[PDB]
Structures are given as structure tokens and as C-alpha cells.
Amino acid sequence: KDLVREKLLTIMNTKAYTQFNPEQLLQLENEMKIYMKSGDSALTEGNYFFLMEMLFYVLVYRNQDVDAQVVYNTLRDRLGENSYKMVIMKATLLQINGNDKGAIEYLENLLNDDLEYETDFVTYVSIAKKLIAIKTTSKNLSQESVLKEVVALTDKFPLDAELWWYASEIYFEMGQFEKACYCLEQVLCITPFNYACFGRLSETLYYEALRSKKQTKTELLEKALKNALRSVELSELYLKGWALVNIISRELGRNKQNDLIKLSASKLKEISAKSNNKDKITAELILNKI
Amino acid sequence: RITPSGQFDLMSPTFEKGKLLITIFVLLVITYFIRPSVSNKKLKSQWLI
């Protein structure tokens, strides 16, 4: 059934597997392998190998991992190991196979061999990302991880929005909630139409406003409104923009927003219609709770 | 049987059809050479998967 590959097309580009429950992830890998082995028709080679490594990384995500070696050996045929992906696969293999730190130093000189730019900028961008991902296991957690990002981020590559997005999390959790607003603005700089940076940039303002002065409370809430309304222009059924509009309207409730509550309620009930799955549970919960 | 202009209607008695056919086959074989090669090579090398 060729409809299957549609999800797979999503799952490569979206990395949907990353935030999946191991129960449904285990279902996903089982549901995958049947179509991977059976429905071998009409799909490109590039899609083939993107699906093949995405099988590898699902299998490493799976709790059984010996099949990861199988997929890697079969995928090691093409372009040797020099591309960014096989650097990733060999590093995560060497790091998981014995829980040895070794790959980093074997990757360390690699970046010192990237001093000549032996590979593309995106490659050692991703190497910087995954070596830091190693190092945050070396140093199990700290705020200085972001400080490490700075020597990697503000010196070498502002352009990766993922870096500023991740930095926002570590600022937002316990750090100052204002530098997340700057960084999320920088995310908007990189891509015009990120409509989830739009919801988050309003949420961080709202959480900042919860601990601010009254005039700053109204100022930040008003800016949060105009950012959540900026969410809405990019989508109709976007649950988080409409919801965050309705939330600050619940907080404020003043006459013109009461009309926008009626309009947002019609749209949010349309969202909380069963066209949407599971997300509807969170949407309805806030709808009917208060 | 006489031809004023030389024969334009008759196809020929004397085509080198074998040369034409072989050149067509040269086209087909060069397709067989390059298509798996170039498709794999360029798509996978420029994507650096």
C-alpha cells in the first residue's frame, strides 16, 4: 500500500519519531518494516537510503539494537563513511556499543581536519551539534552548555535556527525569560513563516509578564496578543495560536477581545472537532475546564 | 524507366540502413551506460546523504 510512504516521507523530514512513545515507536518500526520489505515500488533511491538510515535510528531508538548494526552495514555501501550521516552513525555506534567516550576524540581531530573545510559547512555544523550532544552527557547537565553553544554558535554559525531554538529552552527553563524572546525573534529572522516560534515567543512573554510590573504586565500581554495574532495569520486550525489568544483573552476578557473570544471559540471548537487527534484532548480540556 | 531530377519518390535501392540502425543502437547502449551511473552518482553525491 503506497499510502504508507506518505508517513515515511513525513518522518524523514519531520523527525516525528524523536518525540514518540516507545510503545507507538515500537508499533512504528513494526509497521515500517513490512512496507519497507514489501512495498519496494516506485520510490526513489534517495528516499530509499533516507528510509534506511531512518530505520537505523529507529532501531537505535528501539530497545533492541543489534539490528542497528545490520542496517548500518547494509547502508555502508555508498559514499563510504565520509558523509555527515555515517559520521553520525559511527559516533553513536562507538558511543553506545560499549558506553565509551572514544568517538569524540576521533571526531575531535576531524574538526581539526575541517580547518581546511574538507567537508561542507552543514556537515561540521551537525558535528558541532552532535559533539555537544555527547558533551552534555560528558557534563551531564548545566547552563554552561549554552555557554559552550556560544563558542560554537555566535562564533561559527548563527544561521542554524535549531541552535537558537535549543538555546531558548535552557534560557526558558530557569534562565532569564527575555533572552528567549530575542532568540525566538532571531528564529523568525532565519525562516519567515515558523508559526510555532510564533506561539512560543508569545508564551515566553506571558511567563515573563507573570513576574513583571503592572504596566509591563499590560505591555507584555498586549505584545503577546499581537504575537499570537501573528500566529493566526499563518494558519486557521493552529491549536496553539488560537488557544494562546483565547488564554490571554480569558485573563483580560475586555469587550473587543470578548468578540475575539467568540470568534476564537468558534475556531477552537472547530479545532477541537475530532479532525484532530490527542491534541484535541488538551484543546477540549482547556475549552471545557474554563 | 527515367528520372528527370534523380529519384526523389523511391526510398532508395542503396541505403546504409545498417549504419543507421547501428548508430541508433549506439544511442541505446550509451543510455544503458550513463543512466544508473549518473542518477546514483549525482543524486547521492550532491546530497551527501
UniProtKB/Swiss-Prot annotation, chain A:
Subunit structure: Component of the ER membrane protein complex (EMC), which is composed of EMC1, EMC2, EMC3, EMC4, EMC5 and EMC6.
Membrane topology, from the record: Peripheral membrane protein
Gene: EMC2
Keywords: Endoplasmic reticulum, Membrane, TPR repeat
Note: Present with 5740 molecules/cell in log phase SD medium.
Family: Belongs to the EMC2 family.
GO annotation terms (biological process): phospholipid metabolic process; phospholipid transport; protein folding in endoplasmic reticulum; protein insertion into ER membrane by stop-transfer membrane-anchor sequence
Compartments (UniProt record): Endoplasmic reticulum membrane
The keyword Transmembrane helix belongs to this UniProt entry's keyword annotation: no
Record function comment: Part of the endoplasmic reticulum membrane protein complex (EMC) that enables the energy-independent insertion into endoplasmic reticulum membranes of newly synthesized membrane proteins. Preferentially accommodates proteins with transmembrane domains that are weakly hydrophobic or contain destabilizing features such as charged and aromatic residues. Involved in the cotranslational insertion of multi-pass membrane proteins in which stop-transfer membrane-anchor sequences become ER membrane spanning helices.
Chain positions of TPR repeats: 161-194
Identification of the protein by name: ER membrane protein complex subunit 2
An example Gene Ontology CC term for this record: endoplasmic reticulum
Family matches, as SUPFAM superfamilies: TPR-like
PROSITE patterns noted in UniProt: TPR
Main location group: endoplasmic reticulum
UniProtKB/Swiss-Prot annotation, chain B:
Location in or out of the cell: Endoplasmic reticulum membrane
Post-translational modification: N-glycosylated.
Transmembrane intervals: 14-34
Chain ranges on the Cytoplasmic side, renumbered to this chain: 35-49
Biological role stated in the UniProt entry: Part of the endoplasmic reticulum membrane protein complex (EMC) that enables the energy-independent insertion into endoplasmic reticulum membranes of newly synthesized membrane proteins. Preferentially accommodates proteins with transmembrane domains that are weakly hydrophobic or contain destabilizing features such as charged and aromatic residues. Involved in the cotranslational insertion of multi-pass membrane proteins in which stop-transfer membrane-anchor sequences become ER membrane spanning helices.
Family, as annotated: Belongs to the EMC1 family.
Complex and partners: Component of the ER membrane protein complex (EMC), which is composed of EMC1, EMC2, EMC3, EMC4, EMC5 and EMC6.
Miscellaneous remark of the record: Present with 2840 molecules/cell in log phase SD medium.
Protein name: ER membrane protein complex subunit 1
Phylogenetic classification of the source organism: Eukaryota, Fungi, Dikarya, Ascomycota, Saccharomycotina
